[PDB]
C-alpha cells in the first residue's frame, strides 16, 4: 500500500491481522479453562473469525473499488453482535443459574436493532424512525443488562465474575456507542473509526472473558 | 497445539476459496441473505463440531448430527449461491436436495435425544420421517409443475399438521412423560419450532404461488441454528451433572 | 446439471453429499466407542470416503461425457466390497475370538467375484460364465457367513452383536442383489438404481455397525 | 480414462486410492495400540504415504508421456524398502530385546541392493554384476532374518508376534521376488505387475503389523 | 534474490525461516508446560507468527520495489510489542498474584510510544517531539518494570521466574534500543540491522520464556 | 478422529503443490538426489512430529528440535530445487542459509539430551556453537570467492577438528561420565556421526575446489535423518521406563 498517504489500508491490515491472531488465540486457549468455560472462549473465537472473514471480503471490495460497502459491515454486525451479547448469558450460565429468557430477550433486541439499522442505511425506511427504534432496542438491552435479570444474575456471582461483568457492561455502554454516532454523522474518515471500534469491541471483550474464565477455572 | 494450529489455519484459509460474490448493495436482498446464511451455517458447523468436548458420551451424537445438518446446508447454500450468480432464477432442485438430506437428520434428533435421555420405541421417528418424506415429495412435484399449486400445498399442509399432531399428542408425549425437566423443556421448544419455525416455509411457499428465496433463507437460518442451539443447551445441561 | 429434466444428476448430487456426511460422521463418532470398536468405525468411514472420491470422479466423467463409465464403478466396487465384507470379521473380532481364516476367505471370494464381474463387463471372457462364477462366489460367501465359520462365530456373541450380524446378513442378501440384477439386465435408467443401492449399502451398513458399536461400548 | 482398452490407468488409480486409504487407515489406528506399537503403525503409514506421493508423480508423468519412468520407481523403492525392512526391527524392539546391529545390517543391505539395482537399470554398471550384487544383498538379508539375529529375536516372543514375523518373512521371500524377476525380464506389461506387487507388499505388510499390534496391546 | 551481491535478501530469508521455526516450536511445546504456563508459549508463538506474516509481506514489497516499506515494519511493531511487553504480566500472573493494572499501563505506554514513532516516521508531527515522547514512554515502562509495580511483583517470585524476569529486563533495555537508534540515524544498510534485532528480540525472548516455563512446570 | 483426519488430508494434499520437477532419467543425478532428499526430509519431519506421543515430558523437546531441523531443511531444499530448475548452478547461498539455521539446532541436541538425562553446565554447547559458526563463516567466505580455497578449507578443517576434540575429551566426556548406558551409547553414536558423517562435507568441498550437490544432498540426508533417529531411539528407550 501507500506510505503516509492513506490510513484506511493500514487500518484494514492491522485489524485483519489482529483478528486472525485473536481467533487463533481463543481457539488455542480453550485447553486451559474447565468444562464450564469451554464455550465462552469458542463463541469469542467465532466472533473474531467471522469478523476476520468479512474484513477480508471488505478489503477485497476496497481494492476493487475505493468506496465503503456498509452492507458488508451490517452483515458482519448481524452475525457478531448476537454472539457478543450472548456472551453475557454464557458467562452467567457458566458462573451461576440463569432462567433462559435473558438470552431470548437479548437476542431479539439485538436482531431488531440491527435489522432496523440496516433498513435505515439502505433507505427502506426513513432514517429517523430506524435510528429511534435502534436506540430504543439498545437502551432496552442496557436496562436489562444493568438493572433487570442480568443485574440479578450478576448479584449472585464470584467477585471475578462480577468484575468481568462490570467491565463488559462498561464496554457495551461506551465502546458500542461509536456506531450510532457514525450512523447519525452519515445521516444528518469513518472506516478508520469503525475499524478501531471493532478492534476494541472484538478483542478487549474476548480478552476480558478469557481472563475471567482462566481465573475461575484455575481453582482446580 | 501446533497440530491443532494446522486445523485453525485450514479453517481460516477455507474462506479464501470463497473469493466473494457480492455485486450490489441495497438493491437485492437475495445475495445479502445468501452470504448471511452461508456464513452463519459455517459458524454453527464449527461451533457444533467444537462443543463436543463439554457433552458426555451419551450426548456426543446429538451435537455431531446437528453439525452435519449445518454443514450439508452450508455446502448446498454455496452451490445455490453459485447457481444464483450464474443465473438469477430459483434453485428449486438444490433446495429440495438439501431438504431431503437435512430434514431426516433434524427429525432424527428427536429420537436421538429421547434415546440418550430415556427409553423410547422410536416409532415416532419413523412415522415423522415418512410424513416429512411425503411432504417433501409433494412439494417438489408442485414446484416442478407436475401438480397444481393449491392441491400440492393443501396436501403438504395436511401432512405437516399430521406430523405436528403426532409430535404433540402421539408417542412423543408418552416419551416426554418419563424424562428430566430439562429434556421436557427442550422437547417443548422443539415442538414449538416445528409448529412455528417450519410454518415459515408454507406461507413463503404461498407467496410464490398466488421474494421466496429470502424467506427460505431466513427459515433455514432459524430451523437449523436455533434447533441445534436448543439441542446443545439441553445436552450441556444434562451432561454437566457429570 | 439440468433441472427437472434428468434424475441422474440429482442422484449424483444426493449420494455425493450423503456419502460425505457419512464419512464425517463415522470419522467423528470414533470418540464414543471403546478401543475394541474404534476399527469397526474407521473402516466404514474409509468405505464412505472412497465411495465419495470415486463418485466425484464419476460425476466429472459424466459432465465431460454423457455415458456410463462402468470402469470407475467397478474400481469403486473393487475397493469398497472387501472392506464392507471384512466388517463382519472386524465386529466378530471385537465381540468374540475369530481364527482369522474367515477374513481371508471372505476377501478372496469378494475379489474373485468382482474381478470376474469386471471381466464379464469388459468382454474379456464370455458374459454368462463370468456371471455364473460371480454368482457362485457370492453364494459361497453367503453360505460361509450364514452356515459356515461366520455363523459359528456369531453363535457365541452378545445379543446386540448377533442382531447386528443378522441385519448385516439380510442387507448382504437383499440390497447387494441389485448389482447382479443390473448386470443381467445389461447383458442378456441404471445409474439412478446403482446410486440408490450405493446409498443404502454404504450408509445403512455403517449406521448399523455404529449403532451396535455404541450399544456395546457405552455399557461400560 | 479409456474403458476396456488400457489396464495401466486402472491399476494406477486403484493403487493410488488404496495407498491413500491405507495411509489414513494407519494414521488413524495409532489410537488403539499401546505405547510400544505407536511406531510400527507410524512407519507403515509413512511407507504408504510416500508410495502414494510417488504414485501421483508417476501418474502425472504417464499422463504427460506414455512411457515407464523407472527412475521414479527406484526413488520410491529407495525410500520405502528401508522402512519396510526396519519394521522387523521395530516389532522386535516393541516385543522383545534387540541388540541394535540388526537394524544397521538390515539398512545397509537394503541400501546396497537398491543402489546397485538403480545403477544397473541406469546403465552405470553392467546388468549382470548389479543383479548379482542385489541378489546377494537380498539373500543376506533373508539369511539374517531367517537364521541369524532376527530368528534369535523371534524365538523369544509371544505366539502372536511369532506368527506375524513368520507371515512377514514369507511376504519378504515371495512377494518381493517379483521385482528381481521383472528386472531380469527387462534385461535379458510390467507396470501392472509392479503396481500389484506394491499393493501387496505395501498394504498386506502394514495390515499384518497392525493386526499383531492390536492383538498385543489389547491385553490392557 | 541476488547471490553474493546484497545481504538484505539473505537476512530476509534467514529471519523468515527462523521465525517460522520458532512459531512451530512454541505452538508445539505447549504440551510440556503445565496449565499455568500454556499462555506464555501461546503468546510467544503468536508474536513469532505475526512477525513471519509481516515479514513475508515485506519481502513481497521489497521484491516488487527496492525501497524501505517502514509502514509495514511499524504495523508489525504495533502488533508485536504489546504482546512481548505483556509477556511480563503473563509470567508474573503464572508465578504470583498481580492486580492487573501493570498490564494496562504497559499496553498504554507501548501503544503510545509506537503511535508517536509512527507519526514521527510519517512526518505528521515534528520528528524531535515524537522521538522525545517515545523515549519518555520507553523510560516510563522501564521504570515500571524495574522499580515500580513490576519490580514489586518480581520480588515475590520463585528464583527461576526472577532470573527470567531479569534476563527479559536486560533484553528490553539492550536489544530494543536498536530501533530508536535506527530512528535517530534516519532522522537527524538499516534493514539488515532491523532484521537481526527482530531475530533476537522475537526468538531469544520466547526461548527464555519457554525455558522458565518448562523449568517451573516439570517440577510438578 | 475426524479433526485429525483434516490434518491427515492436509498432509496428503501438501505434495499436490509440488506438481513435480522431474525432467530427465538416468542423465543427471542432481534432480534425482534433490527429490530423494526432499521426500525423505518431509517423511522424517512427519515422523518426528508424530512420535512425540511415546516419549515422556523430558524428551518431548529432543524430538521437536529434530523435527524442525528436518522441516527447515525440507523448506530450503524445495527452494534449492526451484532455483536449480530455474538455473542449473550451485545454490551456495541457500545451502549456507540452511546450514546456519540447522547446525545450531543439531549441536543444541547435545545440550538438550545432556540436560534431560543428567546435569551439565552447558558450556560445551556454547563453545561448539561458536566453533560451528566460525566454520560456516569461513566456508561462506571461501565459496563467495573472498578467500582462497586452500586457506579457508584448512581453517574450516581445523575448527571442525577442534569441535571433535571438544566432543571427545572436553566437557562432553565429563557430562557423559554421569549418565545412563543408553545415553552414553547415544552420545558415542552422535560423536561418531560428527567425526565421520560431517566429514562428508569437507571432502566433497575439496571435490569442488581442486557433483558437489549430490555429495551435499547425501550428507544432509545422513546427518539430519540418522541423527534424529538416534535421538528418537535414545528418547524412547529412556522414556519407556515409565
Ligand atoms: C463487532 C461489531 C459490533 C459490536 C457492532 C455493534 C453495532 C451497534 C451497536 C449498532 C447500533 C445501531 C444503533 C443503536 C442505531 C442506529 C443503527 C445502528 C445499527 C448503527
Ligand atoms: C433445512 C430445511 C428445512 C427444515 C426445510 C423445511 C421445509 C418445510 C417444512 C416445507 C414445507 C412445505 C409445506 C408444509 C407445504 C407446502 C410445500 C412445502 C414443501 C413448502
Ligand atoms: C458399494 C458397492 C457395493 C456394495 C457393490 C457390490 C457389488 C456386487 C455385490 C456385485 C456383484 C456381481 C455379481 C454377484 C455377479 C455378476 C457381476 C457383479 C460384479 C455385478
Ligand atoms: C514397495 C516396494 C518394494 C517393497 C520394493 C522392493 C524391491 C526389491 C526387493 C528390488 C530388488 C532388486 C534386486 C534384488 C536385484 C536387482 C535389482 C532390484 C532393485 C530390482
Ligand atoms: C518485534 C519488534 C519489536 C520488539 C520492536 C520494538 C520497537 C521499539 C522498542 C521502538 C521504539 C521507538 C522509540 C523508543 C522512540 C522512537 C520511535 C520508535 C518507534 C523507533
Ligand atoms: C544440515 C547440514 C549440515 C549438518 C551441514 C554441515 C556442514 C559442514 C560440517 C561443513 C563443513 C566444512 C568444513 C569442515 C571445512 C570446509 C568448508 C565446509 C563449510 C564445507
Coordinates of C-alpha atoms in Angstrom, one line a residue, chain B:
Chain B
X1 CA -1.1 -27.4 20.0
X2 CA 0.8 -27.0 16.7
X3 CA -1.1 -29.7 15.0
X4 CA -4.4 -28.0 16.2
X5 CA -2.9 -24.8 14.8
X6 CA -2.9 -26.5 11.4
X7 CA -6.6 -27.1 11.8
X8 CA -7.1 -23.5 12.7
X9 CA -5.1 -22.4 9.7
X10 CA -7.1 -24.6 7.4
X11 CA -10.4 -23.2 8.8
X12 CA -9.0 -19.7 8.3
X13 CA -7.9 -20.5 4.7
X14 CA -11.3 -22.1 3.8
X15 CA -13.0 -18.7 3.3
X16 CA -10.2 -17.8 0.8
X17 CA -11.7 -20.2 -1.7
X18 CA -14.8 -18.1 -1.4
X19 CA -13.3 -15.1 -3.2
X20 CA -16.6 -13.2 -2.7
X21 CA -19.9 -13.0 -4.5
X22 CA -21.1 -9.5 -3.6
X23 CA -22.3 -7.5 -6.6
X24 CA -24.8 -4.8 -5.5
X25 CA -25.7 -3.0 -2.2
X26 CA -29.2 -2.0 -1.0
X27 CA -30.6 -3.3 -4.3
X28 CA -31.3 -7.0 -3.9
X29 CA -31.9 -8.8 -0.6
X30 CA -31.1 -12.2 -2.1
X31 CA -27.3 -12.1 -2.3
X32 CA -27.1 -10.5 1.1
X33 CA -29.3 -13.2 2.6
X34 CA -27.3 -15.9 0.8
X35 CA -24.0 -14.7 2.3
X36 CA -25.5 -14.1 5.8
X37 CA -27.0 -17.7 5.8
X38 CA -23.8 -19.2 4.4
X39 CA -21.6 -17.6 7.0
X40 CA -23.9 -18.3 9.8
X41 CA -24.2 -22.0 8.8
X42 CA -20.4 -22.3 8.6
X43 CA -20.1 -20.7 12.1
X44 CA -22.7 -23.1 13.5
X45 CA -20.9 -26.0 11.9
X46 CA -17.7 -25.1 13.6
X47 CA -19.5 -24.4 16.9
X48 CA -21.2 -27.8 17.0
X49 CA -18.1 -29.6 15.9
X50 CA -16.1 -27.8 18.6
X51 CA -18.5 -28.1 21.5
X52 CA -18.4 -31.9 21.6
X53 CA -15.8 -31.6 24.3
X54 CA -18.3 -30.5 27.0
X55 CA -21.1 -33.1 26.5
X56 CA -20.8 -36.6 27.9
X57 CA -20.6 -39.7 25.8
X58 CA -24.4 -40.0 25.6
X59 CA -24.8 -36.5 24.0
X60 CA -21.7 -36.6 21.7
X61 CA -24.1 -37.7 18.9
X62 CA -26.7 -35.0 19.4
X63 CA -24.1 -32.4 18.5
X64 CA -22.5 -34.2 15.6
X65 CA -25.8 -34.7 13.8
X66 CA -26.7 -31.0 14.1
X67 CA -23.2 -30.1 12.9
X68 CA -23.7 -32.4 9.9
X69 CA -27.0 -30.7 9.2
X70 CA -25.5 -27.3 9.2
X71 CA -22.5 -28.5 7.1
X72 CA -24.7 -30.0 4.4
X73 CA -26.8 -26.8 4.5
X74 CA -23.6 -24.8 4.0
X75 CA -22.4 -26.9 1.1
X76 CA -25.8 -26.7 -0.7
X77 CA -26.0 -23.0 0.0
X78 CA -22.7 -22.3 -1.6
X79 CA -23.9 -24.3 -4.6
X80 CA -27.1 -22.3 -4.6
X81 CA -25.2 -19.1 -4.4
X82 CA -23.0 -20.2 -7.4
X83 CA -26.1 -21.1 -9.4
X84 CA -27.8 -17.8 -8.5
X85 CA -24.7 -15.8 -9.6
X86 CA -24.6 -17.8 -12.8
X87 CA -28.4 -17.3 -13.4
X88 CA -30.8 -15.3 -11.4
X89 CA -33.5 -18.0 -11.0
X90 CA -35.0 -20.1 -8.3
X91 CA -32.7 -23.1 -7.3
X92 CA -35.6 -25.4 -6.5
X93 CA -33.7 -28.6 -7.2
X94 CA -30.8 -27.8 -4.9
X95 CA -33.3 -26.6 -2.2
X96 CA -35.2 -29.9 -2.3
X97 CA -31.9 -31.9 -2.3
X98 CA -30.8 -30.0 0.8
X99 CA -34.2 -30.6 2.4
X100 CA -34.2 -34.3 1.6
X101 CA -30.7 -34.7 3.1
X102 CA -31.3 -32.5 6.2
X103 CA -34.9 -32.9 7.3
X104 CA -34.3 -36.6 8.1
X105 CA -31.4 -35.7 10.5
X106 CA -33.4 -32.9 12.1
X107 CA -36.3 -35.2 12.7
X108 CA -33.9 -37.9 13.9
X109 CA -32.7 -35.5 16.6
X110 CA -35.9 -36.2 18.4
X111 CA -35.2 -39.9 18.5
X112 CA -31.5 -39.3 19.5
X113 CA -32.4 -37.1 22.5
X114 CA -35.3 -39.4 23.6
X115 CA -32.9 -42.4 23.4
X116 CA -30.0 -40.7 25.1
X117 CA -32.2 -39.3 27.9
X118 CA -34.8 -42.1 28.4
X119 CA -36.1 -45.2 26.7
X120 CA -38.3 -44.9 23.6
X121 CA -39.5 -47.4 21.0
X122 CA -38.6 -44.9 18.2
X123 CA -41.7 -45.5 16.0
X124 CA -42.4 -41.8 16.4
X125 CA -39.2 -41.0 14.5
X126 CA -40.1 -43.5 11.7
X127 CA -43.6 -42.1 11.2
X128 CA -42.5 -38.5 11.3
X129 CA -39.8 -39.3 8.8
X130 CA -42.3 -40.9 6.5
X131 CA -44.6 -37.9 6.8
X132 CA -41.7 -35.5 6.1
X133 CA -40.7 -37.5 3.0
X134 CA -44.3 -37.4 1.7
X135 CA -44.4 -33.7 2.3
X136 CA -41.1 -33.1 0.5
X137 CA -42.2 -35.3 -2.4
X138 CA -45.4 -33.4 -2.8
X139 CA -43.6 -30.1 -2.6
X140 CA -41.2 -30.9 -5.3
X141 CA -44.0 -32.3 -7.5
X142 CA -45.8 -28.9 -7.0
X143 CA -42.6 -26.9 -7.7
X144 CA -41.7 -28.9 -10.8
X145 CA -45.2 -28.1 -12.3
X146 CA -46.3 -31.8 -12.3
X147 CA -49.2 -30.9 -9.9
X148 CA -51.1 -27.7 -9.4
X149 CA -50.1 -25.3 -6.6
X150 CA -53.2 -25.4 -4.5
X151 CA -53.6 -29.3 -4.2
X152 CA -50.0 -29.9 -3.5
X153 CA -49.9 -27.1 -0.9
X154 CA -53.0 -28.5 0.8
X155 CA -51.6 -32.0 0.9
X156 CA -48.3 -30.7 2.3
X157 CA -50.1 -28.6 4.9
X158 CA -52.2 -31.6 5.9
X159 CA -49.1 -33.8 6.2
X160 CA -47.3 -31.1 8.3
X161 CA -50.3 -30.8 10.6
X162 CA -50.3 -34.6 11.0
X163 CA -46.7 -34.5 12.0
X164 CA -47.5 -31.7 14.5
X165 CA -50.3 -33.8 16.0
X166 CA -48.0 -36.8 16.2
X167 CA -45.4 -34.7 18.0
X168 CA -48.0 -33.2 20.4
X169 CA -50.4 -36.0 21.4
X170 CA -48.7 -39.0 19.8
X171 CA -45.9 -41.3 21.0
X172 CA -43.8 -38.1 21.6
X173 CA -45.9 -37.0 24.6
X174 CA -45.6 -40.5 26.1
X175 CA -41.8 -40.5 25.6
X176 CA -41.6 -37.0 27.1
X177 CA -43.6 -38.1 30.2
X178 CA -40.7 -40.1 31.5
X179 CA -37.9 -37.6 31.2
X180 CA -36.0 -35.0 33.2
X181 CA -37.4 -31.5 33.2
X182 CA -34.6 -30.2 31.0
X183 CA -35.4 -32.7 28.3
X184 CA -39.1 -31.9 28.7
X185 CA -38.3 -28.2 28.1
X186 CA -36.1 -29.0 25.1
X187 CA -38.9 -31.1 23.7
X188 CA -41.4 -28.4 24.1
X189 CA -39.1 -25.9 22.5
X190 CA -38.5 -28.2 19.5
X191 CA -42.2 -28.8 19.2
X192 CA -42.8 -25.1 19.1
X193 CA -40.1 -24.8 16.5
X194 CA -41.9 -27.5 14.4
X195 CA -45.2 -25.7 14.8
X196 CA -44.0 -22.1 14.0
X197 CA -40.4 -22.3 12.7
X198 CA -41.3 -24.7 9.9
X199 CA -44.5 -22.8 9.2
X200 CA -42.4 -20.1 7.6
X201 CA -41.9 -22.5 4.6
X202 CA -45.5 -23.0 3.5
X203 CA -46.5 -19.3 3.9
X204 CA -43.5 -18.3 1.9
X205 CA -44.4 -21.0 -0.5
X206 CA -47.9 -19.5 -0.7
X207 CA -46.0 -16.2 -1.5
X208 CA -44.5 -17.9 -4.6
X209 CA -47.8 -19.4 -5.7
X210 CA -50.6 -16.8 -5.6
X211 CA -39.0 -12.9 -2.5
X212 CA -39.3 -16.6 -1.9
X213 CA -35.6 -17.1 -1.6
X214 CA -35.2 -14.6 1.2
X215 CA -38.0 -16.2 3.2
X216 CA -36.4 -19.7 2.6
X217 CA -33.0 -18.4 3.7
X218 CA -34.4 -17.0 6.9
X219 CA -36.4 -20.1 7.6
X220 CA -33.3 -22.3 7.1
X221 CA -31.3 -20.0 9.4
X222 CA -33.8 -20.3 12.2
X223 CA -34.7 -24.0 11.9
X224 CA -31.2 -25.2 11.5
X225 CA -29.4 -22.9 14.0
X226 CA -32.0 -22.5 16.8
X227 CA -32.7 -26.2 16.7
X228 CA -29.0 -27.0 17.1
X229 CA -28.6 -24.4 19.9
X230 CA -31.5 -25.9 21.8
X231 CA -30.1 -29.4 21.4
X232 CA -26.7 -28.1 22.5
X233 CA -28.2 -26.4 25.5
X234 CA -30.1 -29.4 26.7
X235 CA -27.0 -31.7 26.1
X236 CA -24.8 -29.4 28.2
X237 CA -27.3 -29.0 30.9
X238 CA -27.7 -32.8 31.2
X239 CA -24.0 -33.7 30.8
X240 CA -22.8 -31.2 33.4
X241 CA -24.2 -33.4 36.1
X242 CA -21.1 -35.5 35.3

